[PDB]
Amino acid sequence: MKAYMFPGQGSQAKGMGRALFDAFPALTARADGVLGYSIRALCQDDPDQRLSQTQFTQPALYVVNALSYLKRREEEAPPDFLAGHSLGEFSALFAAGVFDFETGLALVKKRGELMGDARGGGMAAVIGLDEERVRELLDQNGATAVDIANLNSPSQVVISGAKDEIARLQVPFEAAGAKKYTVLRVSAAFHSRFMRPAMVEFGRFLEGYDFAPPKIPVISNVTARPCKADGIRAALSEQIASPVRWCESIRYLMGRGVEEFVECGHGIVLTGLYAQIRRDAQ
After folding, report:
1. Which residues make up the binding site for Ca(2+) (predicted)?
2. In the annotation, is 160 catalytic?
């Protein structure tokens, strides 16, 4: 059994998918028209350094992720499961036939806009401590405005929330044994209580869209379980302001019998997390 993993924000880079755009000419020109700019020039040249900003990042990752899946579909046997990290979850739904190429690109476009206009708060990537210790450390240190942003591996947790608390937590976190406390270069606090205004906005935006049932199962970021055709809409809204349960989703797929975990997109971020998750599970 096989599963495809779609990477999210933080794995993009200059030059990504340079071989895909030529292999899929029409698809690339269609993306050009929905976005109003050359997707190719953005990914390969990073014209004026716009790949680090979410409103241009998420569309760029959606196209590269989507073209990689179409190339692997004509070279490999179909996958049994699909999963994506935050933004990748939209590439996983496109691969399952929930929506077509240019519909998913529109949602990601809007999603990139709401997350771009968000201001206030920050993020930090923590390596070395388990979730139960992270929670204990935010309680111990009076960090009342910090939430868990995602659970990427047994020893990797990301926190997000109030800027002043992200910064002052570095010292206690490193004293407790954290291998690395990195304040992420980011504009807002994603997947926390501060994304709720964007969550409500993205909820009314998704009212004008219908979603078809998946043909390949998709493990949700919100539940770490296969999505329901009836619940896809509600889940795409709430995922924005709730933690990504990546570690749980990978473990669910292992319990189902998934043997091969293939990263479908640019980079090998999710391959690194899988190696850690697999060491603790086996």
Report:
1. 207, 209-210
2. no
What residues are designated binding site for Ca(2+)?
A: 207, 209-210
Burial class (CB in 10 A: 0-12, 13-18, 19+), 65: buried
* Element containing residue 150 per DSSP (H, E): strand 146-153
User: The CATH number of 119-186 is which of 3.40.640.10, 3.90.220.20, 3.30.70.250, 3.30.200.20?
Assistant: 3.30.70.250
Locate the domains of the chain by residue range: 1-118+187-282, 119-186
Q: Provide the residue type at 128 as one letter.
A: G
Task: For residue 85, indicate whether it is catalytic.
Answer: no
Residue located via tokens 């990301």: 158
- Which amino acid makes up residue 277? I
- Which one is catalytic: 187, 191, 249, 266? 191
Q: List alpha helices for the chain, DSSP H.
A: 18-23, 25-35, 39-45, 54-73, 88-95, 101-117, 131-140, 163-168, 170-176, 196-205, 232-238, 246-256, 269-281
Active-site pick, 11, 68, 86, 237: 86
Q: What is the resolution of this structure in A?
A: 2.5
The DSSP result for 123-136, as a single string, is EEEEES--HHHHHH
Q: Which residue has the tokens 């929930």?
A: 98
Element (H, E) at 83: strand 81-84
1-118+187-282: in CATH 3.40.50.2000: no
